[PDB]
Amino acid sequence: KKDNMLLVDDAINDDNSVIAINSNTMDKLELFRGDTVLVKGKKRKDTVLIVLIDDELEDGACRINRVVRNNLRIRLGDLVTIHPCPDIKYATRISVLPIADTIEGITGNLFDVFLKPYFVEAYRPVRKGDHFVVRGGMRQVEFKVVDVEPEEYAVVAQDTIIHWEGEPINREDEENNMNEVGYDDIGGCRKQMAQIREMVELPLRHPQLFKAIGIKPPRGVLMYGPPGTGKTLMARAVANETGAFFFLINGPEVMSKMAGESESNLRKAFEEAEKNAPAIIFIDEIDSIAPKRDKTNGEVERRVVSQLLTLMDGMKARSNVVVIAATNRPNSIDPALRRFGRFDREVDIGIPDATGRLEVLRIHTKNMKLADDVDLEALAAETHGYVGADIASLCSEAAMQQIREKMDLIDLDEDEIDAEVLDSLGVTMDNFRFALGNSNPSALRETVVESVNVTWDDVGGLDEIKEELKETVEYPVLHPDQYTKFGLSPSKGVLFYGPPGTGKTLLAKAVATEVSANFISVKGPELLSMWYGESESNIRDIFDKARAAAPTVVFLDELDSIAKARGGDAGGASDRVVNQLLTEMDGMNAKKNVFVIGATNRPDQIDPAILRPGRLDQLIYVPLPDENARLSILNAQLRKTPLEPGLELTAIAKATQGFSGADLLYIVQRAAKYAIKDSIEAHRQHEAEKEVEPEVDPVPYITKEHFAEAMKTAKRSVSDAELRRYEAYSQQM
Amino acid sequence: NGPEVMSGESESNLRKAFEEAEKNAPAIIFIDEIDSIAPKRDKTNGEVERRVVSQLLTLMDGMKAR
């Protein structure tokens, strides 16, 4: 460890142009009380200050006031490199300007008042870009050094000419934001960030390493992946981490209404990137530029593609520029633009894992008065399919929920704002839980499923079936250590079969509500279209949305219409659907861990090519309920009902042997209908006896006579031959 | 190569390449990645692909003994 790098500490000396080192630091690095030292911090910024012996400092980190600390874009507890510069000498002239909001109210001679006594006889060591502070006249004004004559940094001796102007600006706040954000604001993408940093650092600063090894540096990088991942943030961080030129052009803004000058715009962009310095070019949204040369019909876009191909190929060794192109979809790319020489190093910035979600959480919400009872580990563990911007939307929705929560009771008084509510603001766990329950992933927005309030105790019976189901779904998405220690490839599909009215759709709803993962549901023949190619493109982009928001559950309901038996046809469309489903279901490796759930009524018409072991091997039979399962169904269907205390369901469980949950629900609904009819008759009788008093309801519970009248027309659902067919299929399989 | 023939100038490029290979010497032409030029003519729906396939057909057929 070279002792030339030190951390930022609080300031004892309240002066602007000063830093404090300890004496044991002075003997460790020769410097003095008058010595003017160059501080170079993060964000590629610098500053100049006077070193002074400080006993309290302790050699390891340095004291600097908040003004110096700001110019370096550092905080208390950040590292900076310190090194002396006496090459700097007395100024010829200086160019400071007051920031508008620090002078709103006053006017007149700022020089005589603030600047004159501030710089006098101190010969301060200033810098271009510095923003210093001067206290006087019952306020503190902030000026920004806009220009000096003696290079970037100089000293303000009494002979130095201080020029101030009355240009109150707003620009510094805007200037800080664009420069703001470097490489510490992007979390969860460490390998791609290191590769991008290498690709912008090594060919641009020192090509001697690549000349020594003998590998030609690439002059082009492509960024693809899901939307809202961080390609634009990476481009902004790369544009801010270097003070070189950054010619920013976009996709559809290179055109013009005159007779063919977009080629001249591309030529002038390339010549302005070539004229100044070895620089970097970021071309955003190249899908509007490259139409893949197949679905285009014009000549102007082909001339644009040819001009960009000629301007991308003709780069010599003395040019030394690289290009960055952000791209949403990775399939509509021109293979002539993907030729060897222009775009070769394609990075894959995918969805983050739990540690990446923790990194983006600790990046985003660390700039607020947050809470006192928060744990981000459970928030990152429960969240599965979010990527990049959805976490920021979650934090914004939590802040808006906190604002809605602390408004109706504390009386904000929207005509004029107070100062009592503003400091008592904390986004607690309840606002984050409400924001988690009131949001959705950005890839599953168009396939949003309406909320069905069912739990794992609402499905009466099927106890061992539901516990092995919740185990075999909860295993491969949260704890992969048992999967790694087992050493066997897992199942990537499951199927339900049995009589209708048994609980397959109810088990699918219980998966959709209480599995702590994502869920996407389609109907059977919904993914078919009369056009050509769309009937397979629907399955293709549905499975693309499934692979994007990993993990998820794709419930293919009623597979007797998609996976129809082949067996003279209508043209071969269902065969194309089955083949597309087979080639989109066979590309399931250990990554992206999706799960396909099927539930049919007739299992004889399912394709053996899709019932093959290795594609969809599991087969859970859901049989008819027994006595105890029927009692559990009758107890779970009567949960939120005002039942009679002197009423038992064991007689209903014993008197019905071949019944099912659907007709049991029909029995309970007919009993409720009879109770509602009795309530209506008692209400109209009470109205007649009042016009010509009981309780709030004359029938507060469902009596035994209502059940005895509802079970009078209680048929059964399934016949006898269907049970024989299902028993024959269960004996065959 | 295949998709480096486009910019009515694909037919001019095909005629230019064939007359250049016929003018100089008895030689050999390498056409790499023919699947872009020949889209199998039934699944395609464009018209400059049909025109450049017809041009390649009438230019490959028009080679004599000399």
Ligand SMILES: Nc1ncnc2c1ncn2[C@@H]1O[C@H](COP(=O)(O)OP(=O)(O)O)[C@@H](O)[C@H]1O
């Ligand atoms: N990987 C990431 N890490 C941190 N913040 C991210 C990430 N991806 C996206 N964001 C956040 O998403 C918001 C907008 O992202 P943006 O750069 O516009 O997305 P993109 O690169 O897809 O165009 C910003 O608030 C940004 O901080």
Ligand SMILES: Nc1ncnc2c1ncn2[C@@H]1O[C@H](COP(=O)(O)OP(=O)(O)O)[C@@H](O)[C@H]1O
């Ligand atoms: N085992 C069960 N426990 C509780 N309710 C059940 C059960 N089986 C069926 N039901 C009821 O049946 C109704 C519809 O059943 P559903 O799942 O759609 O049938 P299927 O098995 O044909 O897909 C729901 O109102 C549900 O409450």
Ligand code: BEF
């Ligand atoms: F990937 Be981002 F939405 F550009």
Ligand code: BEF
């Ligand atoms: F969905 Be069930 F099998 F009627």
Ligand SMILES: [Mg+2]
């Ligand atoms: Mg973008």
Ligand SMILES: [Mg+2]
């Ligand atoms: Mg169903």
